[PDB]
């Protein structure tokens, strides 16, 4: 874990996320905890043109590396790291299913046993607030207190985990759940859910 | 910016648009402002067989280059350029989500903050009128007065911007919005929207 | 137009159809008019393993080339050729949208001006009848009398045209229409349609 | 049929399943009957990094090869083999359509003649039970008594057949049926089905 190997790795997450359909028109960003702060994708420079040299390091105070412009979503990446000390990588994105669920302002309940993968019996939704402002940072932080992903209302998805591969994987699983929810939800309401006890066994068992 | 570099670039937009799923069976066309008129894709010649030599230049009077047949959608490309002096590239297409929204004859409202990217709090729909006729040109022109994209009822999508990469990007973002709209709209009506004030902050902030 | 160049071409239609999403698990077949009868894909041999040598010629009497087994759908390919003398290539498939429309037993009406591409103001549905039997052949034949594609109820899609590229293209456009229909139809019923007069202009104009 | 050629083949099923969209984030597993027990994918090792050396052989008693960890789904693979003596390959997965149907707890009825491919006039759903426990094994076993695939409620799909290519193919066809079901089902309920007699002809005829 040098800076340049995490930089390559961050960029690999971008092309992997694009591949899967989790990122459209360069909407999302990706970051890893580093030193006293983090390493994040910069704004502007289109994904397919990126290198290790462009990755920006924002320190713990919000002091970025002169000469580079961090993504605009960096404020709620830092919120994610102080909210969950165990998080080492954040993934942000506007995957279509997540975003439509977040536009209904809904948590996904326990419609499948993989719900437990984000730490509990649901994936919450954080209330809307103008991008890059203090209050959005605070909404994200309340949401990730006991959950490892969250929807952002009228906006998108933020997932966090112990490394990029597991963060990238969780973004992806939350996107399958969103879709299963919306599809079933067009047929019936409420959709059937597993109980809190059965979920209790799944969490223990994980 | 020579003619041949814009020609290559126009064709790159075609294969990029096809890649993303924004163009099916060679439905759309693409054009850039050039000299006194524009440069457009020709009719017939299938997309994957195209070269710089085929791109046609239609002058400002509607006088095309002898020996080539402009696309059939060229009339509302020219309508786009006289309607919005700031537009330098037009993208047309029949992306499935846009077209289904345009078949319900509906504007997409402010269901997500990226709505502001087309200049306001909605993506309008221009009334139907037989392809390639004076009145369709006029409907497109009213629609793009204060908007940078528009749906075309029972037809498709037209997006415009300062260059091909940003025009291509906007086609794509309007297609994500369409989909989010129709998906959420199968669950509930009306779908929740951001207010005109919150949109007002988003536009300022862009 | 030798036999081997049409054979290559038939196989290219298969990999093109697969690419687009029009063929799943080797469901469809493809055929061109040849001599007194036609040339068709054989049964069994999986698509990605095919060569010109495998293509079968079924004569006009139903007499196939010893040593090969024509597809099982060959009976309604021959029905297509005697029904429409102008047809030179047939495409069959179970594209998901078509098939779901054909499972509701519905014609797609004039929800978009490309409806005219199959010869009229609708894409019909032929009643169900056990695969490969005389009566299914007859249902297909009534349906293609005044139309160039048709849905097959509880089954799939059959498209025909002057060559493979235009037949393949029409399969594809009927699949976009199916989807637009079903998507809009989950929101509202009946879905809006263009009138018979406006369609009348579109047909003339084509 | 050596161990290493079935190992390669198992892994080829994985990349083929991923390709088609039947496997997301390494959710499914794949197994073939071998000797007195079977050969299965191991847990952990991500799909794109796999080799023949990693495939595990679990004997008929549940005694695995020291040094390797079988998948966690191995218990209902063995249930599949003792339930259906004719099965030589099992495919498991969480394909999105199947899973949403299995979340409504529904069998897919006879909405298309390919329903007969799994042995009867429906694809059943086995009741939910904590992964990897005796009772889930028993539910899977009742379900596959007279069927060659089954949904698993709030979970996924299990398909079985005479070889990997036909097992992989059946997973895929059950996924097309699921989708056709859910799509049509958003428009109307109940969806139209073919009768038990017409199905009776289809089974005979297969
Ligand atoms: Zn964002
Ligand atoms: Zn058009
Ligand atoms: Zn068929
Ligand atoms: Zn599973």
Cβ atoms of C38 and C6 within 8 Å: the answer is no
- Degrees (nearest 5) of the Cα angle C178, C180, C186? 100
Judge whether B180 is closer than 8 Å to chain A, CB to CB: yes
How much of chain D is helix, strand and coil, in % rounded to 5?
Answer: 45, 15, 40
C13 contact partners, CB below 8 Å, separation of at least 6? C30, C91, C164, C167, C168
From the CA of D128, which ligand is nearest? 4
Cis peptide before D190 (omega within 30 of 0): yes
Q: How far is CA B53 from CA A81, B42, B60, B164, B180, in A?
A: 54, 10, 20, 19, 39
Instruction: Tell me which DSSP letter residue C83 carries.
Output: H
In angstroms, the CA C184 to CA C33 distance is 37
Subunits that touch chain B (at least 3 Cβ pairs < 8 angstroms)?
A: A, C
Partner B contacted by C87 (CB < 8 A): no
CB within 8 Å: D192 and C24: no
D185 touches chain C (CB under 8 A): no
- Chain C neighbours (≥3 Cβ pairs under 8 A) are B, D
Q: Which residues from A are below 8 Å from D24, CB to CB? A: 172-173, 176
Task: Report helix, strand or coil for B125.
Answer: strand
Q: Is D9 helix (H, G, I), strand (E, B) or coil?
A: helix
Task: Give the integer Cα–Cα distance in Å for C64 and C66.
Answer: 6
| Phi/psi at A123 (5° precision) | -115, 110
- Match 């730490």 to its residue by tokens: A119
Find, in chain A, the residue whose alpha carbon is nearest to that of B115: A154
- What is the number of helices (H) and of strands (E) in chain C? 6, 7
Of A25, A103, A131, the CB nearest to B173: A25
CA B147 to chain centre: 11
Q: What is the 3-state secondary structure (H, E, C) of chain A?
A: CCHHHHHHHHHHHHHHHHHHCCCCCCCCCEEEEECCEEEECECCCCHHHCCCCCCEEECCCCCECCCCCECHHHHHHHHHHHHCCCCCEEEEECCHHHHHHHHHCCCECCCCHHHHHHCCCCECEECCCCCCCHHHHHHHHHHCCCCCEEEECCCEEEEEECCHHHHHHHHHHHHHHHHHHHHHHCCCCCCCCCCHHHHHHHHHHC
The structural domain count of chain D equals 1
Tokens 């997540």: give the residue: A98
Distance from CA of A95 to the nearest CA of B (A): 9
Give the Å distances, CA to CA, from B185 to A178, B177, B196: 16, 12, 20
Q: Is C135 exposed, middle or buried (0-12, 13-18, 19+ CB in 10 A)?
A: exposed
Q: Is residue B164 within 8 Å of B30, Cβ to Cβ?
A: yes
Q: Do D130 and A188 touch (CB under 8 A)?
A: no
- CA–CA separation, D143 vs B88, rounded Å? 62
> Please, which experimental method was used?
X-ray
Q: Tell me: cis bond preceding D2? Omega within 30 of 0 counts.
A: no
User: How far is the C-alpha of B114 from the C-alpha of B121, rounded, in Å?
Assistant: 9
On whether any CB of chain C is under 8 Å from the CB of D180, the answer is yes
User: Which residue in the set C183, C194, C205 is minimally distant from B128, CB to CB?
Assistant: C194
Asked if D110 and D199 count as a contact pair (C-beta separation under 8 A), the reply is yes
Within 8 A of A25 by CB-CB distance, chain B residues are 169, 172-173, 176
Distance A169 CA to ligand 3 centre (A): 38
Q: Exposure of B6 by Cβ count < 10 A (0-12 exposed, 13-18 middle, 19+ buried)?
A: buried
E strand residue ranges, D37-136: 37-40, 56-58, 89-93, 125-126
DSSP tag of D94 = -
For chain C, helix, strand, coil in percent to 5 are 45, 15, 40
Alpha-carbon distance A104 to A191, whole Å?
15
The DSSP secondary structure of D124-153, one letter per residue, reads -EEPP--SSSHHHHHHHHHHTTS-SEEEET
Strand order in the sheet with D89-93: D56-58, D37-40, D30-34, D89-93, D156-161, D149-152, D125-126
Resolution stated for this PDB structure, in Å: 2.5
Looking at residue C75, the DSSP 8-state letter turns out to be: G
Alpha-carbon distance of B104 to B40, in angstroms, equals 30
Contact D180 C100 (CB under 8 A): yes
| Residues of C whose CB is below 8 A from D180 | 96, 99-100, 103
Closest to D87 measured CA to CA, from D166, D13, D8:
D166
Q: Is B30 helix (H, G, I), strand (E, B) or coil?
A: strand
Contact C154 D112 (CB under 8 A): yes
Among all residues of chain C, which has the CA nearest to that of B185? C187
Decide if A22 contacts A47 (C-beta within 8 A). Answer: no
Taking contacts as CB-CB distances below 8 angstroms, the residues of chain D near C182 are 183, 187
Say which CATH number the domain at A33 has.
3.40.225.10
CA dihedral sign of residues C45, C46, C47, C48: negative
Its domain, for residue A121, covers 1-206
Residue C188 to residue B24, Cβ atoms within 8 A: no
SS3 B39: strand
Is-contact D148 D81, C-beta < 8 A? no
- d(C-alpha C158, C-alpha C142), whole Å: 13
To the nearest whole Å, the CA of A65 is away from the closest chain D CA by: 35
Give the distance (Å) from ligand 1 centre to CA of residue B111: 14
Pairwise CA distance, residues D132 & D140, whole Å: 12
Nearest chain A residue to B19 by CA distance is A19
What is the total residue count of chain C? 206
CA dihedral D182, D187, D189, D191 (to 10 degrees): -60
Could you give the CA distance from residue A108 to residue A177 in angstroms, rounded to a whole number?
8
Which chain C residues touch D201 with a CB distance below 8 Å? 130
What are the C-alpha distances in Å from D98 to residues C6, D12, D152?
Answer: 39, 22, 9
Q: Could you tell me if A64 and A56 are in contact, meaning their C-beta atoms sit under 8 angstroms apart?
A: yes
Between chains, do D104 and A184 touch, taking CB under 8 Å as contact?
yes
Contacts of C100 in chain D (CB under 8 A): 179-180, 183-184
User: Residue C61: which residues within 8 A CB-CB, separation 6 or more?
Assistant: C37
Residue B120 vs residues B123, B150, B202, C91: alpha-carbon distances, Å:
8, 12, 9, 45
| Chain CA centroid to CA D11, Å | 16
Could D185 and A184 be called an inter-chain contact, meaning their C-beta atoms sit closer than 8 Å?
no
- For tokens 């440069």, the residue is B39
CB contact under 8 A, C188 and B104: yes
Residues on chain D touching A172 (C-beta within 8 angstroms): 24-25
What burial class does residue B36 get, using C-beta atoms within 10 Å of its C-beta: 0-12 exposed, 13-18 middle, 19+ buried?
exposed
Query: Does the beta-carbon distance from D113 to C25 stay under 8 Å?
Result: no
CA pair distance A110, A115, nearest whole angstrom = 6
Q: Is D113 on the interface with C (CB under 8 A)?
A: yes
Token pair recorded at residue A120: 């509990």
Return residues with CB closer than 5 A to ligand 4 (ion): D 156
Q: How far is A76 from chain B (nearest CA, A)?
A: 17
A114 touching chain B per CB within 8 A: no
Q: Compute how many other C-beta atoms are within 10 angstroms of the C-beta atom of residue B48.
A: 10
Tokens representing D113 are 């003649």
C38 bridge partner residues = C33, C58
Q: How far apart are CA D186 and CA D183, in angstroms?
A: 5
D45 touches chain C (CB under 8 A): no
Do D109 and D178 meet the contact criterion of CB atoms below 8 Å apart? no
Is beta strand C125-126 parallel, antiparallel or unpaired with respect to D30-34? unpaired
Report chain B residues whose CB lies below 8 A from the CB of A96. 176, 179-180, 183
Count of other CB atoms within 10 angstroms of residue B64: 17
Q: State the Cα–Cα distance between residues C133 and D201, nearest whole angstrom.
A: 12
Q: In angstroms, how far is CA A59 from the centroid of its own chain?
A: 20
Residue D181: closest C-alpha in chain C: C100
Name the nearest CA neighbour of C109 among C168, C177, C179, C204: C177
Check if D69 contacts C (Cβ < 8 Å): no
Q: Where are the alpha helices (DSSP H) in B67-192?
A: 77-83, 96-104, 134-143, 164-185
- Closest-approach residue (CA) in chain C for B98: C180
Contacts of C193 (CB under 8 A, 6+ apart): C109, C110, C111
């Amino acid at each position: 874990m040098e800076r340049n190997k995490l930089a390559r790795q961050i960029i690999d997450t971008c092309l992997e996320m694009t591949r899967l359909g989790l990122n459209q028109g360069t909407a999302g960003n990706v970051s890893v905890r580093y030193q006293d702060g983090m390493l994040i994708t910069p704004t502007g420079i289109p994904y397919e043109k990126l290198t290790e040299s462009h990755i920006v390091f924002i320190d713990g105070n919000g002091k970025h590396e002169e000469g580079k412009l961090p993504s605009s979503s960096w404020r709620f990446h830092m919120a994610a790291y102080q909210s969950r000390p165990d998080a080492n990588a954040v993934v942000h994105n506007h995957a279509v299913h997540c975003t439509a669920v977040s536009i209904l302002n809904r948590s996904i309940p326990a419609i499948h046993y993989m719900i437990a993968a984000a730490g509990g019996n649901s994936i919450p939704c954080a209330p809307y607030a103008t991008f890059g402002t203090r209050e959005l940072s605070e909404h994200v932080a309340l949401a990730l207190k006991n959950r490892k992903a969250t929807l952002l209302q009228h906006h998108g998805l933020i997932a966090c985990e112990v490394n990029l591969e597991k963060a990238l994987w969780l973004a992806h699983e939350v996107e399958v759940l969103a879709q299963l929810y919306l599809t079933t939800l067009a047929i019936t309401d409420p959709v059937p859910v597993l109980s809190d006890e059965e979920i209790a066994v799944v969490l223990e068992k994980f």
